Ligand binder design. Structure first.
Ligand SMILES: [Mg+2]
Ligand SMILES: [Mg+2]
Ligand SMILES: [Mg+2]
Ligand SMILES: [Mg+2]
Ligand SMILES: [Mg+2]
Ligand SMILES: [Mg+2]
Ligand SMILES: [Mg+2]
Ligand SMILES: [Mg+2]
Ligand SMILES: [Mg+2]
Ligand SMILES: [Mg+2]
Ligand SMILES: [Mg+2]
Ligand SMILES: [Mg+2]
Ligand SMILES: [Mg+2]
Ligand SMILES: [Mg+2]
Ligand SMILES: [Mg+2]
Ligand SMILES: [Mg+2]
Ligand SMILES: [Mg+2]
Ligand SMILES: [Mg+2]
Ligand SMILES: [Mg+2]
Ligand SMILES: [Mg+2]
Ligand SMILES: [Mg+2]
Ligand SMILES: [Mg+2]
Ligand SMILES: [Mg+2]
Ligand SMILES: [Mg+2]
Ligand SMILES: [Mg+2]
Ligand SMILES: [Mg+2]
Ligand SMILES: [Mg+2]
Ligand SMILES: [Mg+2]
Ligand SMILES: [Mg+2]
Ligand SMILES: [Mg+2]
Ligand SMILES: [Mg+2]
Ligand SMILES: [Mg+2]
Ligand SMILES: [Mg+2]
Ligand SMILES: [Mg+2]
Ligand SMILES: [Mg+2]
Ligand SMILES: [Mg+2]
Ligand SMILES: [Mg+2]
Ligand SMILES: [Mg+2]
Ligand SMILES: [Mg+2]
Ligand SMILES: [Mg+2]
Ligand SMILES: [Mg+2]
Ligand SMILES: [Mg+2]
Ligand SMILES: [Mg+2]
Ligand SMILES: [Mg+2]
Ligand SMILES: [Mg+2]
Ligand SMILES: [Mg+2]
Ligand SMILES: [Mg+2]
Ligand SMILES: [Mg+2]
Ligand SMILES: [Mg+2]
Lengths: 95, 155, 206
RNA sequence: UAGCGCCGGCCAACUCCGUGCCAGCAGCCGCGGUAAUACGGAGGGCGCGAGCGUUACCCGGAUUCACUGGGCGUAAAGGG
RNA sequence: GUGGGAGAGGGUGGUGGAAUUCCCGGAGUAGCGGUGAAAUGCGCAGAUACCGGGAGGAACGCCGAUGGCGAAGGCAGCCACCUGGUCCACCCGUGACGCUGAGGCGCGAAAGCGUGGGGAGCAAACCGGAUUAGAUACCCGGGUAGUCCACGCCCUAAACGAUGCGCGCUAGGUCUCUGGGUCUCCUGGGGGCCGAAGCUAACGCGUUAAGCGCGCCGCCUGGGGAGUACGGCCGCAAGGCUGAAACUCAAAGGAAUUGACGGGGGCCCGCACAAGCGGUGGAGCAUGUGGUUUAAUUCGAAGCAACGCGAAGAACCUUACCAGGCCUUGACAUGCUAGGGAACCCGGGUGAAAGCCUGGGGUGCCCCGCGAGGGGAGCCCUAGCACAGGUGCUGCAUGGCCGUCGUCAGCUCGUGCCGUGAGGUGUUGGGUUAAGUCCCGCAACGAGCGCAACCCCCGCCGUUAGUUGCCAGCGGUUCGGCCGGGCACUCUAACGGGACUGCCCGCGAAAGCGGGAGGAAGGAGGGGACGACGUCUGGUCAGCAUGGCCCUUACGGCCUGGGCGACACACGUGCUACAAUGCCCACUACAAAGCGAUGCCACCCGGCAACGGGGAGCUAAUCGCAAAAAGGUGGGCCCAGUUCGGAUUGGGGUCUGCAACCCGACCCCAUGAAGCCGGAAUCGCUAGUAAUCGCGGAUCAGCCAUGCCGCGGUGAAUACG
């Protein structure tokens, strides 16, 4: 539901909020246990990072990504997040 | 409790009726460590088992124990997707316990405001009669027996 | 960084206070802001001495500020000269009955802060830290130690990524209460930055 | 008359400024994302000298076609 | 050559039984089948389960095996015929007739192909059923080629011992198949296991070599491109054999090592799960935090390790935010150039305060010195400068400090020994323990940082004591321990003494466990403090610190006005509850441990209370906050949104503050709002624990304090596993 955003050290520009929104938006089309997230995006020197904490049913999975984009970690975060949401579902269906 | 057999304590004498397990009852009734206050609504349930079917409270509570007290009960399991409450034989620790627990419990969901009386009626719902006291222990014994279907899982 | 400062741990134990008197309720901060003005004078003033432990005694009106040192002429002066040089703005910082004093140390390299401010020293000098640390403790150990240690921090080659460099020989049981371990600190700064020095002498058992 | 090459490692010759994954280096591993001995200038240093470097090709290092002098269970390699 | 042996070696022809499916008969009734659980499917048109009869195809149970046979592929009911290879004995004959083998030729799992048969079971494709986001799969019900026979093609493979064939030479131990002997033993052939020497990059090989040698054939020469393309040959096809390059890469690789990790496995610890007493979530308020508002709604922190954290005290102070107003060599740091002024006290001008507009009293000084006065050491102001100042940047440039895994049992070194080496060993194994604690093993033997132990609190009694204690003791008592009196008790607070499985039982090899004696206390007696090398590029540039980075009448200082308490919404931690163990009143008990001068303020009087004015005693075991509450005397409530609720709003106060609109808490009086114990989930807790009540402290005018840190009352619910 709620995509919580943290622009600490960053902007969180409305138009980029769109970028980040669409991506988790994709994600939600595969996993229906999700309640809410809080994502925190911050840039330092070269590496422009992103980290979130992700609530599944009661939650929670969490993870972080680097890159020199600030768009990279966006691409990354999802990817790591994805792997662990899939684990979430399987081994669970395996009980 | 992953290491030892986990010892349980030896509770005080009753200076009232002379017995170590009556002191054991005091404490389940009670909250915030009251050996005066919850002790009243059972020490006004001392004079209430003398003022209805009176005799002496002596054997009313020697027979309030084993009377709703289960020797055979459920403790559950799951096999890879199917869960079985399994009938089981409870030891002198579980068999002195199950009792004093529900004693107050179901007796307090009742209407008669003072439990000096409200729970006192419940010492005759065991040693003698019916109620919501003897209500669960049947289902306790009933998931044992009939649903001993699942006792092929035992420890 | 999960340890203790081993001295504040040994106060009333293996070791005693370096300012010890008695005060009253609003009678405290005063005599306290004093000796802390006194080293505040003796820090910048007494450096090339070896400047190690300043043990400060008092009474009403009358405070005897001891100094325990290395080079007692870097201390005393020309016949009387330096000891009463500072003694001017000193009891004239105090405005009370003060007393200047002297004690030289036996193996000044059996004092931590002393031994370390040479590690500090060698460090801004633009010297060999791997060597220096190594050098320092080696000194201490044949010097009659029976255990010894050093820590130093910040950019040890002046490269961006910091480090922490470390060497010790002989027993040094911080966690043991019968200890007698000097600590002393040495803070150095060169054009790449500040550093830090953490030295431990083990002085033997109790 | 004195010049050409180079000074991260191979490989002998190091510091400062400018630049800041840009401009550019590069034979190989690589260097540059703001203190870069690796770019570009400078000071110096090493090398050679009317030359010094680059490119192309030949043998060498290639014991990497193995006569001298290599190999094949799992590295390339025993034929179903 | 003779004589003998074993064998799923091969080809043909026959024949045996079990089981599966189908069909007919009998019998019999409501489900079967199937999965993790289901559903499809089958079934009252009579299934499944049972009996008999019949048909047909495939495979060949037990024997059966690390077994045997073959050159390989590969070969398994039994019988016969036809046939190959092979081993042994005898030492008979031949007389070097040997070995290998480019081409060639033959053989060649399965799948596939052609013509014809056959077709039970199974089963690509295919259809359903479930799963799933999808499921062109995995599991389930069906199901066609195929599987089977004959003949003919196909010619591939992890066609593997990933190891070409023959010969000779170089320890043995063991078991196994199979011949022979004068038989525990030996000798020949075959199949395994461990291993001498040797080999090896290592793993490993080792008389069945991957050792030493010789012969001959095959093959390799970086990865991808690619077993692709082209040509050729073969094939009915599918496709097979032979087999490039361009281009691109700085690697691709083999074995081993240390970790990390596994929906790998073992053994073990933690209130980790279970099991319990209670909570959050759902109520209203506090406080924090997300979003939005604002001109400021100031920064940090952010899963565990941020959300009553930084903040142990925001009315403007604070305060880094913002408006309007100011101020600048500066509010402060040294430093000096050129002067005043030498210091100062008091005004007063415009002021919201600042800030800027300006009157006047006025120097003690080291000296020339009566003196006219003088450098002046002051200090003061004006001009200057260097600069200060910056809570403006960079916690990935740092120190210090701290959070963290975690009070977890570990992290290592010396020297020896193993390995070419990374490295191992130790530190593993076995037994105990809270622990790398100890014990026993053992190519290790020690040692370091950790652990424990040494340090405080608490609990036994002693030591040295008493301006706190005591009819303990006798007595008066103003009958309050008041005093004469008393240092023994309690208190108090410095030393002490001690308890280690020392002792007896059971086990044992030791450590130790199991068990008891006693002891106030035991197997560390219960709590703190202490936290290893390291981890997280954890946190902090806003405590301070520091490399640089940039602002230098502003991004520097001060003031006034406001803000951090806005308010559409969310969450975090919490107090009071939502009632009879309970809601009030009056009656009345019991703790420590603390904190006290424009402080604690005994006591009176006014008042309803807030509190006000008075009043003593205190630097405080001997004065004050001080009343501890829950409980308990026993009285009113009688299931009642209520005598539960203490909340939003109403009034008039009180206090401190210069000041309480924003934005203070307490008082008396009026609103007496939710809230009926709370979903799904989720957070603690193993003794004096949760839980209930009460007191003190920091900080601080005052408190927005229910929070933070502590003190003391009664007293459990649940642990095998
Ligand atoms: Mg060269
Ligand atoms: Mg060189
Ligand atoms: Mg450029
Ligand atoms: Mg860099
Ligand atoms: Mg170069
Ligand atoms: Mg250069
Ligand atoms: Mg050469
Ligand atoms: Mg050559
Ligand atoms: Mg050769
Ligand atoms: Mg080779
Ligand atoms: Mg190969
Ligand atoms: Mg061949
Ligand atoms: Mg072939
Ligand atoms: Mg024959
Ligand atoms: Mg039939
Ligand atoms: Mg076999
Ligand atoms: Mg002859
Ligand atoms: Mg001849
Ligand atoms: Mg074939
Ligand atoms: Mg076939
Ligand atoms: Mg066919
Ligand atoms: Mg056809
Ligand atoms: Mg399907
Ligand atoms: Mg199927
Ligand atoms: Mg076909
Ligand atoms: Mg091959
Ligand atoms: Mg061959
Ligand atoms: Mg072969
Ligand atoms: Mg060969
Ligand atoms: Mg053999
Ligand atoms: Mg064979
Ligand atoms: Mg052998
Ligand atoms: Mg080899
Ligand atoms: Mg190639
Ligand atoms: Mg092919
Ligand atoms: Mg072709
Ligand atoms: Mg065809
Ligand atoms: Mg490998
Ligand atoms: Mg593992
Ligand atoms: Mg595991
Ligand atoms: Mg950091
Ligand atoms: Mg740091
Ligand atoms: Mg070693
Ligand atoms: Mg060696
Ligand atoms: Mg080693
Ligand atoms: Mg280890
Ligand atoms: Mg050992
Ligand atoms: Mg700072
Ligand atoms: Mg309740």
């Amino acid at each position: 539901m709620q995509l919580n955003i943290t622009g600490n050290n960053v902007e969180i520009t409305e138009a980029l909020r769109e970028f980040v929104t669409a991506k988790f938006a994709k994600l939600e089309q595969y996993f229906d246990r999700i309640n809410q997230v809080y994502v925190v995006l911050k840039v330092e020197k070269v590496t422009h990072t992103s980290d979130a904490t992700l609530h599944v049913n009661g939650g929670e999975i969490h993870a972080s990504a680097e890159g020199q984009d600030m768009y990279a970690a966006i691409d990354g975060l999802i990817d790591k997040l994805a792997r662990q949401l899939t684990k979430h579902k399987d081994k669970l269906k395996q009980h | 409790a992953r290491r030892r057999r986990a010892e349980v304590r030896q509770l005080q004498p009753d200076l009232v009726y002379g017995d170590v397990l009556v002191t054991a009852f005091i404490n389940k009734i009670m909250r915030d460590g009251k050996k005066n206050l919850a002790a009243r609504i059972f020490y006004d349930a001392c004079k209430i088992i003398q003022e209805k079917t009176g005799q002496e409270p002596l054997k009313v509570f020697k027979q309030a124990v084993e009377n709703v007290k289960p020797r055979m009960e459920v403790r559950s399991r799951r096999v890879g997707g199917a869960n079985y409450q399994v009938p089981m034989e409870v030891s002198p620790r579980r068999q002195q316990s199950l009792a004093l627990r529900w004693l107050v419990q179901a007796a307090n969901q009742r209407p008669e405001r003072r439990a000096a009386v409200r729970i006192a009626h419940e010492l005759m719902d065991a040693a003698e009669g019916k109620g919501g006291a003897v209500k669960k222990k049947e289902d306790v014994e009933r998931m044992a027996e009939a649903n001993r279907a699942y006792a092929h899982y035992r420890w | 960084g999960n340890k203790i400062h081993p001295i504040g741990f040994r106060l009333g134990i293996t070791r005693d206070w370096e300012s010890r008197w008695y005060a009253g309720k609003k009678q405290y901060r005063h005599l306290l802001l004093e000796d802390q003005r006194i080293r505040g004078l003796l820090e910048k003033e007494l450096y090339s001495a070896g400047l190690a432990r300043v043990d400060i005694e008092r009474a009403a009106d009358n405070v005897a500020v001891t100094v325990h040192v290395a080079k007692p002429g870097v201390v005393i002066g020309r016949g009387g000269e330096r000891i009463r040089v500072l003694r001017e703005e000193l009891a004239k910082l105090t405005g009370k009955n003060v007393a200047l004093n002297v004690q030289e140390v036996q193996n000044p390299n059996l004092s931590a802060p002393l031994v370390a401010q040479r590690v500090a020293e060698q460090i801004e000098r633009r010297f060999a830290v791997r060597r220096a640390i190594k050098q320092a403790v080696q000194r201490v150990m044949e010097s009659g130690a029976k255990g010894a240690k050093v820590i130093v921090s910040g950019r040890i080659g002046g490269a961006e990524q910091a480090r922490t460099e470390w060497a010790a020989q002989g027993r040094v049981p911080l966690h043991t209460l019968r200890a007698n371990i000097d600590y002393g600190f040495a803070l150095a700064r060169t054009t790449y930055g500040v550093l830090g020095v953490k030295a431990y002498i083990f002085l033997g058992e109790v």
